[PDB]
RNA sequence: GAGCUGUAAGUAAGCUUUGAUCCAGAGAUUUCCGAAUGGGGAAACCCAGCAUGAGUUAUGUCAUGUUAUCGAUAUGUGAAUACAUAGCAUAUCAGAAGGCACACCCGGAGAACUGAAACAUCUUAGUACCCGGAGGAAGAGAAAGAAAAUUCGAUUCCCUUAGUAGCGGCGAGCGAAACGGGAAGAGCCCAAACCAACAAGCUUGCUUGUUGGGGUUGUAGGACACUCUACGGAGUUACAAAGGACGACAUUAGACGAAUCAUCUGGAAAGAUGAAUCAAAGAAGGUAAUAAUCCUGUAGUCGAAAAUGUUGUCUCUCUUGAGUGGAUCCUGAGUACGACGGAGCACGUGAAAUUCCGUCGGAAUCUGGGAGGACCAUCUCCUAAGGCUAAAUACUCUCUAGUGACCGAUAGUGAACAGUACCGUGAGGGAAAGGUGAAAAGCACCCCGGAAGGGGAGUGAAAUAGAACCUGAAACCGUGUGCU
RNA sequence: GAGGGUAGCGGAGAAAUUCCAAUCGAACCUGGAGAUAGCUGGUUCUCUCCGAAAUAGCUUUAGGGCUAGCCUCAAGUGAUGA
RNA sequence: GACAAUGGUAGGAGAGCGUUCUAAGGGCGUUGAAGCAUGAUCGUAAGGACAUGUGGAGCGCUUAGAAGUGAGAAUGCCGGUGUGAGUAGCGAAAGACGGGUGAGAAUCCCGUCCACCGAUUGACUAAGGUUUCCAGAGGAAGGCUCGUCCGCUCUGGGUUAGUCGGGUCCUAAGCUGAGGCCGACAGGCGUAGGCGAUGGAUAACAGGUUGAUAUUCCUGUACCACCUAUAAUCGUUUUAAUCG
RNA sequence: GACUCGGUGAAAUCAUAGUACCUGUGAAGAUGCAGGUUACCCGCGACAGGACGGAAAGACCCCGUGGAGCUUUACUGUAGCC
């Protein structure tokens, strides 16, 4: 289960292998948006003209994998409760620092 | 007043009812006495006038 | 615990870690009509009285309360009529009224087509329809019973007895019960004799009334006579009733939850090939093809501020129980029975005993009364004419969790997108209609054209996947050709 | 012309079986109800072996039914068949 | 191996083919499943394969089990598409020309001439309908042809009352009806009283003005109810003026 | 109206149709059978002899132990009345 802001990989699809960054997340549908990776080319109308754009599209949340903050490889997560509160964990290491 | 058949000689069936042999008498009812109608078995057996 | 302002896409303007949107419990608000209830009315509107209040120089206007009919409980008053009464008036209470899944249950009333190879007794059938009353069940229920052993011991339901015994234009057809085997199991309260009081007549004797106690039955019990005895038991499901405490479970939101990498084909891998791992978890669904190890989950374990539902332990609240005498007193009356006319019992009035309704008659009192299939005698069993009672049984418009050698868009609900289009004055009848793609990336720009449509270019794995969008049969309509 | 009344086992009729929502020797709607139909129509893949009847008798029977006759399958007995 | 048998309707007997689902086993599939299309293939029949094109995710085989298990006919039910056929019809009637607009004009707009109704094809008010009304834009479907037009599609607008017609007034027929009478239930009737116009009562006219309303808006001049002030007349409140 | 040209454009019906006549034959009145006799392929305007032409599961007739309405000194009942 992926943030906001998080450095992710992703494990399925054409750009399998890159690493990028979550800008969105969209939860109804669970499909979140990952910078440089599943990009698109939209015919937009003059609304100025506007031709060809580039942007990128929103990839099913099961395709992507948080990274071990320590030892640099996918790694499903955890929770544990520190000061009554519920954290993050690597299932491989410690703490996951998400803050932003 | 319930129902019942009539019966032929032949036995055929006809619906049918028996009424009661109600009289209207001036009979004490709580207080002032009115005029009801009573049957004469009851009046013979458990009412006064 | 990070996004959110319904389906529902946009833009705009905003909200949110000082915790939003969202989920569960409890509150607040809740226009008008409708039993509709201040009066009326063609529902969803019109028109008022009374009392407060705002406003106006004052009217007009507005706001908030209250005002149906029967019923109950008080008070006052009182006609033909003197007392009285019928009425009448005022004030408190809020008892009824209407609706449903009204499926199952109990009552009232009750067909015909049909079968009998016609039809009338009979059958369909006490069925359909209609009306009333209710409950989570209802009804029945504690022997005036079943029987004929050496008997049993309230009721209901299941299996058998048995298509037997019986009934029947003895035709068509209708059709039990006791014994035996099981589920469940529970018993009680009155009326009367009598006693103690109180009250009116009365003459203080009696009568009657009211309260309380007592008391409840068959090989007879109880009153009375007498002799032996006391707070442990009992309880809100009948057996009398209220309400407190502290607990324990279960619902109604949730939380944690093991284990995988690489290459090939491909638009994409979960597939193939190779090497690993978890299992109290190899149920299931998603993910760009077919995943125990990617996601939601699963086995397992944990969790409630609040409101309900059960259930314990205390509290609480009630309350003596035996024996002998047995025939002095009490023991359910217009009742039981009978005649006439009917109905229900498997049973068509018959050898009809047994049980109900209408109309007339009309008993007995323990040496009594009833039943044992006309009646009589002897035997055997019981004790009517007052009431209450859980469980085993029936049903599903619903709610929660699941299941299927059940359907897969002419099927399955009439209805996957509707009691709607539409039809009928009305009651009423009643359709047709699912599928782009993995992702909208839903075709910028150029050309012909008023547009609609099209040809290129581009997106995409694919556009003869372009929204009349998966596959795309046949009938039917065309264009071009080899032989004729 | 407007506002009203009479309803199907019934109403209305200067009378014709006439009218009661384009329908009347008994309106329309829903239910009993899949009424009943000895009558007519229909009843869906293949091959192999055998193969009739259209007649007695009774029948509220005559284009229906029942028993017998004639077909088929299985077992049995054994000259009973032509 | 020898010999024999083998037409067939009602109808009896036997052996099989194929369809959907289930169990166990064993397989195939993005290097392309089911379905669909074509072929000169195999089996005694029902039927079974293989190859190629299309299609884009599921499906055979073996043994056994279970059935909504096979269609050419029912004036069958539903859907689609033909034939008749470029055929019948295009719903009473008088139009002609010039100019305009438009991609496009017999059919739309403007003008002149001609024609038809005129106890009416003219002008008002009711029922009934319910936005059809007006302006700007449009031309897929509707319009029995056409259409640049429209009672059609889109966007935005439009109905003004003390006196007009209803209610806050009255009653007819009829309908309801507190108490009441009757009735298996359901319910039927009826007294006082209510409701109910098609009738009785009842105060406003002339002119101006919009694309769309007018006795309603505006101007002028009126009338009818009700309330409060300013007042002559008011004189126990019997009476008196008053009201009743 | 019909007929020719421009616009628009149905219907009943329909087993498949390359659909002649005569004398016969035949379920006894033939475009489809036999023996002959006629006839190049394809339209348009007309006529009504045949296709036992279309339309409506004959209303006449008979049958069904089928219905309904009416009558009476048919059978059995019954509302009422005495
Ligand atoms: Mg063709």
Same mark, same amino acid.
């Given at each position: 289960?992926?943030? =906001?802001? %998080?450095? !992710?990989? *992703?494990?399925?699809?054409?750009?399998?292998? &890159?690493?990028? #960054?979550?800008?969105?997340?969209?939860? =109804?549908? %669970?499909? !979140?948006? *990952?910078?440089?990776?599943?990009?698109?080319? &939209?015919?937009? #109308?003059?609304?100025?003209?506007?031709?060809?754009?580039?942007?990128?599209?929103?990839?099913?949340?099961?395709?992507?994998?948080?990274?071990?903050?320590?030892?640099?490889?996918?790694?499903?997560?955890?929770?544990?409760?520190?000061?009554?509160?519920?954290?993050?964990?690597?299932?491989?290491?410690?703490?996951?620092?998400?803050?932003? | 007043?319930?129902?019942?058949?009539?019966?032929?000689?032949?036995?055929?069936?006809?619906?049918?009812?028996?009424?009661?042999?109600?009289?209207?008498?001036?009979?004490?009812?709580?207080?002032?006495?009115?005029?009801?109608?009573?049957?004469?078995?009851?009046?013979?057996?458990?009412?006064?006038?």
């Amino acid at each position: 289960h992926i943030k =906001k802001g %998080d450095n !992710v990989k *992703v494990i399925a699809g054409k750009d399998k292998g &890159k690493e990028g #960054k979550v800008i969105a997340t969209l939860p =109804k549908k %669970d499909r !979140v948006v *990952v910078e440089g990776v599943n990009i698109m080319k &939209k015919h937009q #109308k003059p609304t100025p003209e506007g031709g060809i754009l580039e942007t990128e599209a929103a990839i099913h949340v099961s395709n992507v994998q948080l990274l071990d903050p320590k030892t640099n490889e996918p790694t499903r997560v955890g929770y544990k409760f520190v000061d009554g509160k519920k954290v993050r964990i690597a299932k491989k290491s410690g703490e996951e620092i998400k803050s932003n | 007043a319930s129902t019942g058949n009539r019966r032929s000689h032949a036995l055929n069936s006809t619906k049918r009812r028996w009424n009661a042999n109600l009289q209207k008498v001036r009979i004490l009812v709580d207080g002032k006495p009115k005029k009801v109608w009573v049957s004469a078995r009851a009046l013979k057996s458990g009412k006064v006038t």
